[PDB]
Design an enzyme around this catalytic site. Structure first.
Site, PDB file in Angstrom:
ATOM      1  N   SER A  58       0.854  -1.206   0.000  1.00  0.00           N
ATOM      2  CA  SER A  58       0.000   0.000   0.000  1.00  0.00           C
ATOM      3  C   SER A  58       0.883   1.246   0.000  1.00  0.00           C
ATOM      4  O   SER A  58       1.725   1.393  -0.885  1.00  0.00           O
ATOM      5  CB  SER A  58      -0.979  -0.018   1.193  1.00  0.00           C
ATOM      6  N   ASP A  60       2.240 -17.462 -30.364  1.00  0.00           N
ATOM      7  CA  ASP A  60       1.968 -18.504 -31.358  1.00  0.00           C
ATOM      8  C   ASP A  60       3.270 -19.214 -31.747  1.00  0.00           C
ATOM      9  O   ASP A  60       4.336 -18.907 -31.198  1.00  0.00           O
ATOM     10  CB  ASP A  60       1.167 -17.975 -32.566  1.00  0.00           C
ATOM     11  N   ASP A 120      15.004 -28.544 -41.604  1.00  0.00           N
ATOM     12  CA  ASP A 120      14.023 -28.844 -40.552  1.00  0.00           C
ATOM     13  C   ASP A 120      13.556 -27.597 -39.826  1.00  0.00           C
ATOM     14  O   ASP A 120      14.344 -26.684 -39.589  1.00  0.00           O
ATOM     15  CB  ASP A 120      14.640 -29.768 -39.506  1.00  0.00           C
TER      16      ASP A 120
END
Ligand SMILES: [Ca+2]
Ligand SMILES: [Ca+2]
Ligand SMILES: [Ca+2]
Ligand SMILES: [Ca+2]
Ligand SMILES: [Ca+2]
Ligand SMILES: [Ca+2]
Ligand SMILES: [Ca+2]
Ligand SMILES: [Ca+2]
Ligand SMILES: [Ca+2]
Ligand SMILES: [Ca+2]
Ligand SMILES: [Zn+2]
Ligand SMILES: [Zn+2]
Length: 616
Positions: A206, A577, A588
């Protein structure tokens, strides 16, 4: 992890966080203990008294009852014992060579007019030989003279306080004004014990969080720069420093947290103020009785409306966020992960589903983590990707779809599917994972869930309609002598195996070790498991599932109608993604998730679609 700090590892950052929380709770000396216990037992029917707000803002005097605020008579000893358990002991004024005032608790006080009620705890952590190793500085901030807090309506008081933090660098300079001299004594004490700035932890909640941000702002220029490299973790701060030094942790629905932009009052300060902030954890929800309640949320969300302060209270910070620290999902999280913390009262917990309501917040992005309590919880995941953790107690889970991990924890736990058993497929690796696949292909990986509940529109087997409870067993889901069989599988061992799918399609469970999984012309589900697995499609529409520390896998024969599913893996930022994880190495495509990888042998990255690569 959500509380990663600087370049500290996941684990070191958690230890720092736990210490910050402990010294922060200590600085309040159990102010909210009686209130929290009343809430836990009875709920929030009676709301929150203004006296609790003014106590939080202005401080108290001291240990005893204040109207509205039940007082735990052992508040003081409980707080001291708890901070000692966490490894901390208050340092005396004599030890610091500090000429100023400390009270009966050992609390230090502010030094200049306007700050004389500001408080700080200075604590030491010691090795087993009694040598000082760390210093903790826990600010308990106050607004100024207590007497000012009741001169206007509570709303007007809060509004005026917020507006005054920014002008003339009030918030920025707060710690220099309040504790400038004490902090010089702390520097000397640290140096006398062979400590440097990196050995100091600064925390508070706070207005104490405002103080943490202030000290960080001043640390480059004051105290000879000694504290520039100190560790700053602020809870529920209305402000954020201009440095890159402060981890600002808070609940999204805490109306104090991030109320100001830096220290600037904006048009959102007295409403919803949930814009992303670089220093802050932006999407941790306190799922408490207020958040859950239609009635409580009739009025627009505002810091000026006292009931909203239920989410600011420190006990729920300590209890809720420690459960995040303890989570089996912790290492999957990041600073802005959506995390829903079960913080219901006992009466509300009995009949309220903990879920992401997305109330009073910007739209949540990415996977969702829902963290239960040690009691019996009702937990509801959404139609996206969810990580649901029951912890102790007999927990019941529901989930709306997608790809999920559901951890029952201790107790007798239940997954309620709310639909016919006939719409689902079930598989089991014999290693404690029960896989549930819905009609749309979403997969939940479940552990420690011994009962599945389905809702049957007809008489299942010609026997049971409506809600049906199935027992999870090695041979399938059982209702008396009736069995719903697991999908065809081939199970390996924890050594290196070659597993061959049958033509009809199989779940292939490699388990530990470097496995050789030979799919067939059918639709197979490949679970290489730990180790570096070579997995060959063989034809058909195949699924390759990756969870945990899954190793360095090679996938052969991947085509457009196949699917990769990454669920509970490392390095996934909200809404990532596959492109965020993809590169080409020779011929590859390689997908990297932390230290784990999948090589799609002879697949060009430009041939891939997001629909075929699920990142949860
Ligand atoms: Ca953020
Ligand atoms: Ca948010
Ligand atoms: Ca539980
Ligand atoms: Ca449980
Ligand atoms: Ca889900
Ligand atoms: Ca194996
Ligand atoms: Ca394996
Ligand atoms: Ca196949
Ligand atoms: Ca295929
Ligand atoms: Ca593997
Ligand atoms: Zn030592
Ligand atoms: Zn082979």
């Amino acid at each position: 992890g959500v509380y990663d700090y600087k370049n500290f590892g996941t684990a070191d950052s958690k230890a720092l966080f736990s210490d910050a929380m402990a010294i922060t709770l200590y600085s309040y000396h159990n102010l909210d203990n009686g209130f929290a216990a009343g809430y836990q037992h009875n709920g929030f029917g009676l709301g929150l008294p203004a006296t609790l707000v003014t106590a939080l803002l202005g401080g108290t005097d001291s240990q005893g009852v204040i109207p509205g605020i039940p007082w735990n008579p052992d508040s003081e000893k409980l707080a001291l014992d708890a901070v000692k358990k966490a490894g901390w002991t208050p340092i005396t004024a004599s030890q610091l060579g500090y000429d100023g005032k400390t009270d009966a608790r050992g609390t230090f006080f502010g030094e200049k007019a306007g700050y004389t009620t500001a408080q700080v705890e200075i604590l030491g952590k010691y090795d087993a030989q009694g040598h000082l190793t760390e210093i903790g500085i826990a600010f308990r901030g106050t607004s100024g003279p207590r007497e000012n807090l009741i001169l206007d309506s509570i709303g007007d008081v809060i509004n005026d306080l917020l507006a005054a933090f920014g002008p003339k660098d009030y918030a920025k300079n707060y710690v220099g004004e309040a504790f400038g001299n004490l902090l010089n004594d702390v520097v000397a004490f640290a140096k006398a014990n062979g400590l440097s700035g990196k050995d100091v932890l600064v925390s508070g909640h706070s207005l104490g969080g405002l103080a943490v941000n202030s000290m960080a702002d001043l640390s480059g220029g004051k105290w000879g720069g000694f504290f520039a490299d100190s560790n700053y973790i602020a809870y529920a701060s209305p402000t954020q420093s201009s440095t890159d030094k402060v981890l600002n942790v808070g609940y999204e629905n805490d109306p104090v947290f991030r109320a100001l932009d830096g220290s600037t009052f904006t048009g959102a300060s007295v409403g919803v103020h949930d814009a992303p902030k670089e220093s802050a954890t932006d999407n941790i929800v306190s799922f408490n009785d207020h958040y859950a309640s239609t009635a409580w949320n009739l009025l627009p969300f505002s810091i000026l409306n006292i009931p909203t302060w239920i989410s600011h209270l420190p006990t729920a910070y300590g209890d809720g966020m420690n459960r995040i620290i303890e989570s089996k999902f912790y290492d999957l999280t990041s600073k802005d992960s959506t995390i829903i913390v079960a913080n219901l009262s006992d009466p509300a917990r009995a009949n309220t589903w903990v879920q992401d309501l997305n109330r009073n917040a910007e739209t949540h992005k990415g996977s969702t983590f829902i963290i239960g309590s040690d009691s019996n919880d009702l937990i509801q995941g959404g139609s996206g990707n969810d990580y649901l953790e029951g912890r102790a107690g007999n927990d019941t889970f529901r989930d709306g779809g997608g790809y999920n991990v559901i951890l029952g924890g201790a107790g007798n736990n239940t997954l309620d599917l709310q639909k016919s058993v006939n719409t689902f497929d079930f598989a089991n690796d014999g290693a404690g994972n029960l896989y549930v696949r819905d009609a749309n292909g979403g997969i939940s990986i479940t552990r420690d869930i011994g009962s599945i509940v389905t809702k049957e529109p007809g008489f299942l087997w010609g026997l049971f309609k409506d809600d049906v409870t199935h027992s999870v067993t090695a041979s399938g889901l059982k209702v008396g002598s009736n069995v719903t069989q697991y999908d065809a599988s081939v199970k390996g061992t924890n050594g290196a195996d070659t597993l061959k799918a049958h033509a009809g399609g199989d779940w292939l469970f490699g388990l530990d070790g470097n496995d050789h999984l030979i799919g067939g012309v059918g639709n197979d589900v490949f679970v290489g498991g730990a180790g570096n697995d070579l997995m060959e499609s063989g034809g058909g529409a195949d699924t390759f599932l990756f969870n945990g520390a899954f190793g360095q896998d090679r996938v052969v024969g991947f085509t457009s109608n196949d699917k990769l599913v990454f669920l509970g893996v490392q390095g996934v930022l909200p809404n990532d993604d596959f492109r965020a994880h993809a590169s080409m190495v020779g011929q590859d495509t390689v997908l990297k998730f932390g230290g784990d990888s999948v090589t799609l042998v002879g697949v060009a990255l430009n041939s891939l679609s997001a629909d075929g690569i699920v990142i949860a």
